[PDB]
Symmetry: C5
Subunit: 400 residues, 5 copies
């Protein structure tokens, strides 16, 4: 259109894109900054990197891009590309992207009264501190720091508008609690001028259904299966095999799965604590299995039972568990020979009785250890899980 | 040519690439937008990222790029590169690429009557919601949202043309069901102007041949082989080894293959449910194996069976399964000694008979458990698989 | 030089880089397109992406870049950079690179008679269909489609010259069979103008030495050592251990190694078929081992051998395999007592006689199944391998 | 503003961005270079790559960008983008990024007296030598070398200001010791001119809580559990199983975990030394277990022990460990026959006694080797861990 | 300064960056090309990609960039950025980066007599053929080809200066042997003009301390521990378990670690050959263990030993190994009964003697095969290691 073309010709006349568009130079320029979050595309615990897809909202009044709509009847808004009009140098301070600016420079809508608008999208990659102490029931606060790079408080009076999450799409792993913001002024060793900034904190809670179903439940079930080593009769040579195979499976599990955790040293993760507790339980189970096998395979001539252990293990533990406690010269020479045979048989029977008593003591120790270990692992797992905060509310929100 | 050079000289005379080419500024500009899908290169279930090779189709009428062919006899079409003529700022709203615009800016052909065409290719990386509840028999709908970034409904009246899949090449993993689309107008908190957009939904079904062959069949086969623990005679100490080895192999299979699923918590995947069912079956098989070994290795002097279990396990289960149920003074002192030997032998024989009865009870329990577990696992696998919709048609298309 | 500088000044005068350099605008411009394959950098079966390092070759006559060498004695060729002269917009249609154009824009040589040359290099990433049905003995045909983007048949008459592989550096994995090319005209729904293109098909054969040494041989050898379960005497209980451990090793092998295959569903790959056959063989070997152990550990009082199985297993299989088939009152009651002990011993002897017959039957079944499984695995492996085409020629080229 | 626009117009009049802004060309230009470390985002031991978020600080006096504020009442500072004013070509010499320069070119603040300021951020990726001889208790010194690329001592007199870590955020894995630096002049084979540079050395210490908890503790515990093979009674048959399973688990652990060490050959890492010691201990334990099983399973008729091993193993080791040491014609023919039976029984008892003495000797060796191996492993692990320097202080800082 | 600004104004007057700066156009331009290798950042055996950080050195005489220093007292050197003065289009022919030109375009210094200098750095990624036949003791020669892209011999007379490695920082993994180069002229099918090039060959040797310590030693030790299967007494059922577990661990080791070799078929790598030999040794050991178990568990009623094997295994091998070779009517009916009992006992003793002889033969076979296998494995490992060239010098340089 003739009017649009003439207005475009007259609008850039004597216009310098480097100049701050203010009628009075001594007065600061007010820029309203906001944010429009859409997706928490990825959060990387190991690298402490937050990746989001957001739209930055900026607005300011331009003193030179004004016209009377009566003289230009058809046009009411005009769009300027990058590098043709002044734009704020608002940057993400704590950006982790290889190129510092991840915004996609788009056009700039302009009022008929000089008011401007700027909505550059972009995949923002910010470095936020990630806490894994209460993993996976942790609540993460990551901060997005936005502020003008080379404009101070006397020049660009940055202002805050509430973040908009109307277009936000739910993430399958993280539940958003809110995105509050704050505006503050900081001094720098470079210069004697304040540099106001707008910081948006992203509070997200991790959904624990997948992790609880894939890590906690299988490991708890395998630990409960490890207790089966104490129900295997000692006569079958499979207790050691079962215990060591369970331990090998679990030690493969921890190293293979719980490696996505960052190599931080701020504190021990809850999952690490619980894996360590399970490893201790399984190792002590193997130790007790070795002790039980040592008691079971005792030589009758190796040594009699000591009085204290004999009396305690055959009276007190039996009472507690209600275990059942088992239990012419030719004739002369031929008689002597058969007497020898029978005496040897009697000695064999006495040795067998001693061995049976040893086996009973071993089985009693085994049952007592099974009960104690089951109680210990139940209480330890319950306490470890309940130690983390927001555990009950997380379960109520996820499983219920 | 002289005519072509003169027309190029006269075409850009007083031409502003920022101006919307409309004869009447108060009227909007009609832009026909379409899409030409070529390949679904990659869909990332874990990353919720879809990657496709597509060509965007845009066409609009330019009021300033017109000429009389009679005055330029040889030329009929001209091409302008990027940044020399006005082009719609149509962008992919839900882009997941590091740079928002993935299009490759190509030349722009022009009619002799001002009509234009624009066919920029590009590797579009859009973020779509990926549902894995019915994996691998899931049907996925992902939306590609296209619309002008800075032009509203009063300026750029975006229209729609049906997507073209004539050049589409098939994927070896996903079967296209179609690419429908819709045009809608929505408001934004920025401005009081509607912004029409065109959204193309991609409906793709996953081909399940590879997954069913490489995950389902091996796991069902190994679960069926785990039932062999109940056909092993208890006299050989290998039931526990077989069971624990099968369980370890299955837990490695799970934690090694079922990891490409995203860590979502919307719902439990079907494959996760079926792996959990298989894990429960194998664990309970190990528990029953320990029970059978406990029954088999019973001390004769430990205690007789309770009459209830004796009668039930020796009558009812035997009848149901048609089990076969097995079964001077020198002479005086020599007499007493052989009497003692024979009495000891008779006691040994009766103890052996009791032990054999215990072994029979253990074997009968084992067989009953084998039958029950086979029925349970068959019905559970069949039900879990048949629960997912479109299962039968997926099989008919893939295997048949 | 003065002459060179003057010629450069006069050559750009009134030159428009957007104009097609033709004396008669109605006459199409002839562009000779060729390719210079240098390397096959990488071919990605999983992602269906081919990566090559090639030099495109273009040649066309320019009407405006001509001069008389008599007037410029010293200069005979001139080079222009990108964006200063007209260049064909020849693009790789089926490109899979994040940016569509992977070429590196270099200078353009010019004759003293207007003839031009343009050889841009680049790492080209094309989406070619990869067939893994006969993996690893497959022959892959991948197509590189080149053609002008915005120029039709009435404007840019593309012509094909034979591809040059003179500087081709052989790859250590793939053997180049040839790079034939073809030129065709195809229509588009946009426009009523043909768009000639040049398509180069890359026929490469996979060298199978590495794959046959690292995958086929170890799996065959592991199956051969899994057949050893049928040579272990049943009295020693490690048959189940050996069989299950070999099955575990093989199921780890297949999952860990045969994962570079794409998740395609066009057809079952040969390596997948062979792995499935090996899995079936090992699982059936475990089943037969369980059956053999069940026959070996049979209670003598459990039941006599059925007549049919007894006669056939002790006559027909023995004949076939030529197996060896094994085999005052005081005195009165002392008589009665010794008679009792001897009768018990005789019954005992009959008991181990029956047990030895059972063990012989189990061993005969074991040897028969060993022979059957050996012959079956041999014929299955040979047939599966020889089913794929070009097997013999591939072996003759690689190993011989 | 009118004053701002006029000043911008007059400031770039006759200004060449290529010219070094100095009043006297013969005098060098003083540029104060500093650094503002913000985060140690990632260090790559395998790739010898350091990644940090830093802000470079540069300052210099410009003789052409000066004005009298009395003539421009409102403006006091002006900002110039890249490419419009002269900037130092200060580059990171040892950069490991695909593009050599990673700085984000930002605007340039300017005084009212010509003084300048330049604060370009960037994700700096540098190649620093990484020493793993004391892993994970190592202290790393990586050098960042900054200096002008094409300006010498006579032209650009680079000066140094102390690095600022006021805005530094702690890293969860590395504890910063300090960031000292030095300025030096070094010559080049190209040119007879010094090129002063500023080199910042980053001294970081690795926090060892995570590594000590996840690698040292599990491996020490597994090694301690490997000694349980010596407490297993020899009558049971799981000693070899336990030993070989522990060795397999440990080698799987080492292969899967100690792979993020770089493949350097400068020296053997401490973790590699300790893993090798553990592997040697476990292998020698398996050898000792084989020897003990050979001693335990000795045929009585195979031959009596040598007198030397007899006396030593039954006297000296027993004393040291205080182990208990176990321990008408018809009548004639009937006597002869029963005498035969009894003599055979006596010979059997003699052989049994010899075998029991063999078992006692085997158990004595087993206990002695258990004690020796426990002492050896404890001293070896303590010595290896204490060999690394700063071990005590690292433990005190992390665990205490 | 005024002089510097005036010289900058006068230097670019009538200047054309496209023009070759030569006084006589017919005469070629002499460009001195060199290289300053700094670091071998990474070499990719699998990808056949060599990554180095180098500085390119170029120098040429410019006819138009000359001035009299008397007229410009202060300035003596000037710097031009990219695109303002003519630069050689020297490119890396065999590049592998996604963009062909990986150099960073820095400033260009100029003499007071027209002599120029150009030092563009960059991370150069070149495709070099990598030979893994003698891995890890291989010596790699990779070629970096540099030459003018669009300038021939008649125009740009390229000259070579020796590569500079003064600034080289030694790599931990690879030892530099030297970087010699050559200059040659090649003809291309495009043009009838020679195109001289400079090719630098990088001769690098791999330091083998890490690989020898982490692959060769563990596998040799594991094979030596697999040889322990022949010292286990056959009475303990653990030979099969030990052998199969070692084979499983080794087959995990190979497929898990020796995967960074490329899938090349030029020749079998030394490490692959050694792994194949170890696998064959372990499999044959398992076969021999199965044979020994078959001999040990022989039914005495199965059949007598063949005379040949009896005599050879009891005489020749025993002599060679010096193995010890073990070794009124009532009275009548009581006589008959006791005679029966004793006759059965004598038959039992004869059977036991036959079984003991079988056990002796099995043990002798076991010891003989142990000796043979130890000798075979030691000779095979020594020979396969010594086969590779530069083995002794690599050992002397690394371990000594
Ligand atoms: C607040 N700004 C952003 C970081 C430093 C500071 C600054 C000061 C002067 C010139 N550039 C940047
Ligand atoms: C519809 N457009 C795209 C997203 C927001 C909106 C918009 C409005 C004004 C200026 N830029 C963008
Ligand atoms: C041949 N070109 C490449 C693909 C389609 C066709 C085309 C048609 C119109 C405008 N641009 C491209
Ligand atoms: C100090 N500069 C940076 C590295 C080399 C040196 C240099 C010398 C001459 C021309 N360019 C660079």
């Amino acid at each position: 259109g003739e009017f649009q073309r003439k207005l475009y010709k007259e609008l850039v006349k004597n216009y310098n894109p480097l100049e701050r568009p203010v009628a009075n130079d001594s007065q600061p320029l007010t820029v309203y900054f906001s944010l429009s979050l859409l997706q928490i595309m990825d959060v990387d615990e190991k690298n402490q990197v937050l990746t989001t897809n957001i739209w930055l909202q900026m607005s300011w009044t331009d003193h030179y891009l004004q016209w009377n709509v009566s003289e230009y009847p058809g046009v009411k808004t005009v769009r300027f590309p990058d590098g043709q009009i002044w734009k704020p140098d608002i940057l993400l301070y704590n950006s982790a992207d290889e190129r510092f600016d991840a915004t996609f420079h788009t056009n700039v809508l302009v009022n008929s009264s000089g008011h401007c608008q700027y909505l550059p999208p972009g995949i923002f990659k910010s470095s936020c501190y990630i806490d894994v102490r209460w993993f996976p029931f942790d609540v993460q606060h990551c901060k997005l720091k936005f502020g003008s790079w080379s404009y101070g408080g006397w020049s660009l009076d940055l202002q805050m508008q509430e973040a908009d999450i109307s277009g936000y799409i739910p993430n399958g792993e993280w539940d958003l609690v809110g995105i509050p913001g704050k505006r503050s002024e900081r001094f720098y060793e470079c210069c004697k001028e304040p540099y106001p900034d707008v910081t948006f904190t992203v509070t997200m809670r991790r959904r624990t259904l997948y992790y609880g179903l894939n890590l906690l439940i299988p490991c708890v079930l395998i630990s409960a299966l490890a207790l089966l080593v104490f129900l295997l009769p000692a006569d079958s040579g499979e207790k050691i095999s079962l215990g060591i195979t369970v331990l090998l499976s679990l030690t493969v599990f921890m190293a293979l799965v719980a490696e996505i955790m960052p190599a931080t040293s701020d504190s021990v993760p809850l999952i690490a604590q619980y894996f360590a507790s399970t490893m201790i339980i399984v190792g002590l189970s193997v130790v007790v299995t070795v002790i039980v096998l040592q008691y079971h395979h005792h030589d009758p001539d190796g040594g009699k039972m000591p009085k204290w252990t004999r009396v305690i293990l055959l009276n007190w533990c039996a009472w507690f568990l209600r275990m059942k406690r088992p239990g012419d010269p030719d004739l002369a020479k031929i008689l002597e020979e058969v007497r020898y045979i029978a005496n040897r048989f009697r000695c064999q029977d006495e040795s067998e009785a001693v061995c049976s008593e040893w086996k009973f003591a071993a089985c009693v120790v085994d049952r007592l250890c099974l009960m104690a270990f089951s109680v210990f692992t139940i209480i330890c797992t319950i306490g470890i899980l309940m130690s983390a905060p927001n555990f009950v509310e997380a379960v109520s929100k996820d499983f219920a």
